[PDB]
Every structure is written in structure tokens, then in C-alpha cells.
Amino acid sequence: ETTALVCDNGSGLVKAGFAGDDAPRAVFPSIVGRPRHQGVMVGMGQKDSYVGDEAQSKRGILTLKYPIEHGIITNWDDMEKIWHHTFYNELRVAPEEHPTLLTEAPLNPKANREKMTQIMFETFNVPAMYVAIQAVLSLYASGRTTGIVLDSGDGVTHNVPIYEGYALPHAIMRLDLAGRDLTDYLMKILTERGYSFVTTAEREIVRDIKEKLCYVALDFENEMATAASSSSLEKSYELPDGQVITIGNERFRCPETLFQPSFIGMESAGIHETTYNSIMKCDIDIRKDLYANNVMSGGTTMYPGIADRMQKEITALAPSTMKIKIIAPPERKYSVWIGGSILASLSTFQQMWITKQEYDEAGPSIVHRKCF
Amino acid sequence: HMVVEHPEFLKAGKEPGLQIWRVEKFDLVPVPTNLYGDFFTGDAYVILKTVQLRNGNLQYDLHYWLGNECSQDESGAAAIFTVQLDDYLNGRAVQHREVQGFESATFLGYFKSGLKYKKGGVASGFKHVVPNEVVVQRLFQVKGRRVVRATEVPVSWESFNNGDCFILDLGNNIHQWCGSNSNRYERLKATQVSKGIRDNERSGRARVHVSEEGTEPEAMLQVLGPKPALPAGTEDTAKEDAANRKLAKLYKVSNGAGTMSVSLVADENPFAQGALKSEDCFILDHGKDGKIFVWKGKQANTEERKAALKTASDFITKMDYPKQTQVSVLPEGGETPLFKQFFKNWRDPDQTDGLGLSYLSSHIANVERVPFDAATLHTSTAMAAQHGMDDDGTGQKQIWRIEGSNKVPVDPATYGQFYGGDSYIILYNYRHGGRQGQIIYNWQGAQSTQDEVAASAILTAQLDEELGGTPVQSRVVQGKEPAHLMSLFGGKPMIIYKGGTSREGGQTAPASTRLFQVRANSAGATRAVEVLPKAGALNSNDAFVLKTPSAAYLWVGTGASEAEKTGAQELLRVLRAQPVQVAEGSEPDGFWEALGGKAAYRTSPRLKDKKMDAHPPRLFACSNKIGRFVIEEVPGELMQEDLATDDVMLLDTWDQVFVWVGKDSQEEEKTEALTSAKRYIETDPANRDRRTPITVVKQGFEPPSFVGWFLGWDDDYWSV
């Protein structure tokens, strides 16, 4: 009768809600804001730290810190603040009578996995918990069981091939290039037009500019020649102090770090070579449906024209007899939460729950054996 | 089995006896006769016995004997000489390995007196080297204003001053020491010479340290000693530039004039790199500190090289150079960077000019603009079909339907009766003798929502793993079934209802007036889907079933196959009703008032025609979203989701090729698709009419001739 909670803790956003629902109830960015100026007016409502949307609404006077940097968790006290905020303030529910499903990127360090257990049974005292791979939840949310998932969020970008509902560990690939790196690259290349953005609040503004006014060019050199020859690609954006900036070719140069990582100085290959080498390390008979079931997940796959560019690049690399289908659902920003929400609400799921009893007879090592 | 012609092998194995050889510095010497039967403990031996047989042939036997103190070269040479002596013979010999103290009993049998061993032996032919060893301790003073040069100075603190720069070379560590009063150019020359000594003399197996006054490391203070007070430094004038200008003499050695010739090329450095001709041999004489470089060309004769070495050795005693002078022999492309400093702008062949370019290790697609040829469409129709589904599908199966968050079994009287808005799992057992086996099908309806299809996938994976992983899965959507899945019900049609269960509404009640459309392919697999009951939804190729709460109607068009009529009457027995067998063109008024309409259903003369099993209608997708324009097939029969809004579509019906464009399809897609459709018409193998008409169809405005080929048209599919 108790409703389970699903809490996808990404690097940039937290998507939390109840199992069985179609949409996550609370979506808020995973930041901790602390004051950096001198408070002169007494009384009032000054707090030592602000979490979530309250930190976004007051970000002009706050320094902002992300607890998660490139997937791994650096600060655990701030992550406990994030979990306390999403339990008590957003979902407004007591977590000692709801089992909680958590998500995790693959090829993570193992020391996080028991440590995520080490808070959840000791501070919040959940009755049960489970850790699931994000890519298999994205594949389940599409209604598929075999396919390759390109999951790209704010911290990492990983290709995971899944056959018969199980990820193949010898072909999962990780690329440390995602939305925060594209935001930093866009801060770097907006200095060419004379705009300076160095503050973390200005980093949030440039992230908003990247969300509103960026797209993937179908071919890079012809689009650069088009942007050089005219001004039809220029767009204007209004800063919150009323200043209007104009961006031209920088609309499409910032997604191109996904396909050419050498812009930010990385020797590693693009996402299409990563998908091709991830497919090539699988067995010969199952390569037919991996090319035909290529789903995309995460917020960084939300640019216009990313699927056409991906099909163009994979088609040039694959043999010509193969059939290529890049699958881009419109709900792919929250596909991890939808797969977790359906997977937690099943009546056949209530024996894979890691309850309190086996945890406190087994210690913080039960998560390495029950969560595959 | 290449033979060898060693001259001592000619006396081996010609008369019956016993022959012994000893290895001395990669060669065999036969030991004398009265030294037979005894061996040195630090040498290697080759033993031969040849034996005459009764039948006339002459057998052979090789042994090779190794002592416990022999080196690697002696034992290896003994093994290789044993192999080569077998190859000199016609492979008729057997080889044995003999170790000192562990000999075979047959090896003891050859010698009459026995085996006795002495200490000592001949020395090994190897000379000892260590891989990657340098033992170097030198010191260089670099000095100058314009013409900066390096000069070797003895390793002491008294050789140092404050106005020059110094390079202390200690093998794997190179220390660069810059004076306080040193200028810009000799610092740059010190850096250049230090990086040259690292990357060329030592091939990068070194580390260059840069130091100044007060920051000397422990290595320099350990080698040189405690640091005295430095005796300042003279200001860099122009007289020592002239002194650096007169340090080397470049000479030529060449037999191009038909005789011996040692002639002066230059005595003024910086020299020209082009002066080093490739057909001759040149000599640089920086012999004040004791260096003479002999530079050999690639196209120089051998006597020129020996004459150059002889002349360089003759320069030792003539000009009275000190007795440590090194004659360094340098080929082309292998020059020491102490040789390179006397030349104006030395150019290695793979240098970077300007800023240079990066390699980037990864490239994007730059495919050439080829025009696409449409004749590859109807030709090369490769198809894989099934791999293990050879049975006709009687079997033993279990069908589950997903409601909410749990699956239930369906009723066993209702196998082939699915709901369009639900999701199903079908477990199937092979009775076939091909090692049995199990198939799990995951059927997903078109009207089914996200929660049902996600739960169907998760329960499909769970049902696969809890049976041990032996069954294989197959995701299937509505309209795209394989032939084996249609054969699971045993000649029955697949009945698809409208509506289904949900988490908030439960099972939907069926409508009072229900209309059913029956299709059958060329093979015989047959569907019967529920459609909304209007008079305009009738297809003249098809068989339709009308269920009213007064009576029932079975309407047959002129294009209906017999499988469609059998599926229609099977659906009548499913719905428990008795039809009256309505035919096309002879409909009663009761049928038309049951539909609530009069006329204007889907009619074309191609849909009138009976013959369609031999010629299926073929649907094609035209796009240029990968940059190159491609037409592809779509497998399976025709529904809404095959029609892509962003792409152009072609339908071939053997008498009229439909071209269908979306709302947001590009116009060059349309025009070059028209040309591709035309070229597809002329290139077909069975000759057809060249004036087959091309009709352009817009999205939302389709004629019934186009619509009638689609199973279950929805008018409000694209409209939100």
C-alpha cells in the first residue's frame, strides 16, 4: 500500500516523484548556494545555505556549487542537503515508510555505491532501496529490451549496449564531455564577440542561452561558409539586465564539441565513433538490431538536428547493407525517471528490494550483490 | 631445407665411424683423434655417428653436447650447426640433446673408456654490452653575441664564469646553468643545444634541467663540489664573434676528378647546408677541443669513405691536436647537434614551417555527392526470413495481458483476439525436434500507452531470466508481425479490437454497431481489425463484417480473396452471429441504414481487380536528412506510422505510382523523388507502360485510391 519513491539524481538536475506516475513531481537543479556578501539588515530571513530553485531565484548574491562533478559525488554533506530538500520540502513526505529507488551511471567507482547506502539507511532510515542503471531504464521506457543507449546529461556521456535486458560490460563506453563542458566552451567562445561571463550566475545565464539558441549543423564547413557569407543565422538574446547580445556561428559551434572533441582539447573521439566502437565490440549476430535500435536519452540530446547528424555519421561508418534508425522520443529528458517509475510500481518487484534486515546483518556490501 | 656449403662438412659422414667437432667462436673445428671421448666443461660439441646397414644404406645420428659452464653463443651455435648439418644431409638423421652429467645411456655406449671432464675451455665470441647505457660526464660553455658557439671545457667550478652559459652533461641528466650577466642569444643557444643533446644523441632518454645562481640542484653540487665565488664576466663584444667565426674548416673528399682530392670548402662559419653535397665525403675539423666529424654522403664510393677516415686520422698528428680527439663518423640524416651548430639554419627533413597543423586523430563524414540510381530498388531484393521458426505453429503457448502493473493470463478460448490499446506477452514452446527451445513474443498495440509497453518490456525480460535465459525474445508491434506469429493460432485470423484496459477506466464497453475490416497477404496470413462504422470506410478489395444488435452483415468486394471470406466467417462464428452474405453492388437498404450512409466509399479500378497476390503494392521512403538522398523499403504492410511527415513517400500499385508529401517536406525532395519514381518505372524487369501516371498527393488531402491500400485509415491521426 506504500508508494515507492523514484529519485533520479543527475549531475545537473534532480528528478523526483512517486512510482506509478507518468511525470516527475519535482524537477529542480542540484546546486547549493551560499552567501558571499555582507548582511547589513538584521532579522529578516537570511539562511546559511540555499538549495534548489531558491538558490536560482537568489543567484545574484550567492556562490553556487554543484555537488556532482562529472558523475562522481565530491561533496557528500551538500548531497545530503539535496536529499533532505527533495524529501522534506519538494515531495513533502516522510521517507521512513517509503522505499526509494535510486539511479546510477555505469562504470562508476564502487565506493559511491555503499556510500549511497550509508546515508539512506542511517539518516533517513528508508525501509528498502534499490540502485538501477540509467541506460536500462531509458531502454525500458521506450518499450524495448535490446538496443544501444546514448545517455548524455550534464556530467557524462555514455554508450551502453543492452541485449536481452542486460547491459554488456565489455562494450560500455564513457566520455567525459556533456552539458557543463558545452556551457564552459560557450563561455569561452562568447569572448570573441566581446561578452564576458565569469560568474557562476553568468554560467547559469550562458546555460540558458545554450538551451534556447543552439542547434547541430548537418554539415559543419558549409554552415560556417554560410555564416561567413551573410547574417541570416544570427539571433538575439536579452540578458536579465536588459542588454541585448547577438550570436551568429556560435549557435552551432558549441554542439560540435560533441562530434569533434578536439575543440576543448581532447584526444578522444566523438560520440558517433564511440557508438560505432561500442557496437563493434559486440558479437557478430547481434549487430543487426543494435544499429536498428539506437535510442537517445538525456537533456544533452535535445538540440535540433542531433538525430539527423548522428544518422549521417553512423551511416558513413557502418557497412552499407546495415539499416540505421536513430530513435529520439520527445520525452527523452525524463526517460530514466519513467523507466524507474514503471519498474518500481510492479507487483513482481517486491523481492529485489534491499530491505533493512539484510543490510544490517550484511553491512554496506549488500548493494554489490543484489543490485547487478 | 636450403643446403649449406661449409668446406669442413664435405668430410662428414662418408665412411662408417665417429666424428667430433668443437665450437670455437661461431665456427666448428674438428678435435684431434686422441682427444676423443673427453670434453671441456665450458664448451659445446657436435657428435656424429654413422652406421652401415645390411641393405647398403648408411644411417646417421647427431648429438649436440652442452656443458654446465658453456655460454649462450656456444650452445646456440651447436644447435644451429646440428640443424645445418642435418640439412646438408637429406634429412635422414635424428638429433639428440646431451647435457653434462645427465647423458643418455646410448651416449655412454659410444665411448669405450668413458666420459671424463676438464675445467676451462675456449672463450665466448660475444662481447658484453648493456641495453641503453651511457656513461658521459662533459661540460660545455656556450658563448657569443651574434655568432654563439659551444666549446668543451673541463669539468670544474673554476671553468665557470657569470657572463656565459653552461651545459653539464651527465648521461641521463643534463643541467643547463645560465649566468646572471648572460644575454638572450646564448641562453637561446644553450636551450637549443641542450634539447639537441636530449633528442638526438640520447633519443629522448634524458631529462633537461634549467638552473641559475642559488638554485643549483644536488647533482651539480655533488659532481662539481661546493660553490666558490664566480669571477664575474666580460661584456659580450664583437671580437669573440670573430673568434667564433674562425673555429672550423670544412673540407671535401671526392674522386669526381678521377684522382685523390682533399680540398678546402670553407673556413668561415656559419656554413651552408647545401654545401654538403650528397655524392662526396666532407670533414669538419673542430679540433681545438678535439672533435673531427667525418660526414658521409649516401652516394659516395667506399674508397672516398676510407680516404676520409684516413685523412681525418692524419689531421691528428699534422696540426698537433691533443690526445683525446674524437673522430665521429656521421651518415646523412644522422648528424650530431654539435656538428649542426656551425651551419646557417639547419633543416631536418620533417620540420614544421610556420605555426603548423594538428592531426586531430578523428574525422567527420565528407561523403561525395553521388546521384542515386533507382534501379537498385526493385533489383537485389535480399531477405533473411526466419532462422529457427520452422514449425507451423500448433505448439503449446501461454498468453498474458498487462493490466496496470501486473500481468494476468487471458482466457484460453480467446487466443487470437487482442485489444489495440493493450500489451501482451506470448510464451511459445517448440514441440519441434530441433533441440526444443522457447520463444517469448512481446506484442504492443498501436493505441497502447507508455506505461503498458514499458511494463510489457520489463515483464518480458523478467520472464526470460526466471526461465534460466534459454528463450530468445522478439519485440513486435501491431502490423509488423512475422509469418510465424500469425501461424500460432492455427489458420485463425488475428482479431484486433478497439480500446482496452487502463489504470483509471478499466475495461471499455464494446460499441453497439461494430465494423471489422479483413485483410490477407499473398502468403495467407490474415488480420481482422475494428474500424469506426461509417459508409466511407468500406474498401472494395476487402471483406467487411458488420455487427448490429438487430442482425449481422458480411460484405464482400470484388477484390476479396477466399482467405478473407474464410476469416470473415470465422469472425462471425467468434461474434456468435449469422450473416446474410451481402455482395458488392447488390446491397440492401437495411445495410446502408445500418451504416447510416449512402455511398462514397474507397474505390479504384486497381482495387476492383482480383489479381493482387502476384503483384503486391510496394511502399517507399524518400529522404535527404543524412545529406544524401536515399529511397528505402519499408517491410510489412501499410499503416499510418509508416507515412513520415518529414519525408516523401512513394506507393507503387503497378498502374499508378502515388507520390505523397508531408507538411514539412522539402521541395527538392519532391522534385528529385518525381525523377526517381520515373526512373523506377522504366527500369523494372517486367516491362510495363512507360506512361504510368505520377499523381502528387498532399498530406490531409488524399484520394480514396491512395487510402484504400492502407489497413485501418484514421482521418484524425495527424490532426492534434
Ligand SMILES: Nc1ncnc2c1ncn2[C@@H]1O[C@H](COP(=O)(O)OP(=O)(O)O)[C@@H](O)[C@H]1O
Ligand atoms: N532544450 C535543450 N537544449 C540543449 N540542452 C539542454 C536542453 N534542455 C536541457 N539541456 C541540457 O541537459 C542537461 C541536463 O540533462 P538531464 O540528463 O535531464 O539532467 P542530468 O544531466 O542532471 O541527469 C543540462 O546541462 C542542460 O544544459
Ligand SMILES: [Ca+2]
Ligand atoms: Ca541523467
Ligand SMILES: [Ca+2]
Ligand atoms: Ca666457452
Ligand SMILES: [Ca+2]
Ligand atoms: Ca632429420
Ligand SMILES: [Ca+2]
Ligand atoms: Ca657572454
Ligand SMILES: [Ca+2]
Ligand atoms: Ca663521389
Ligand SMILES: [Ca+2]
Ligand atoms: Ca490501455
Ligand SMILES: [Ca+2]
Ligand atoms: Ca534469453
Ligand SMILES: [Ca+2]
Ligand atoms: Ca486483399
Ligand SMILES: [Ca+2]
Ligand atoms: Ca526531410
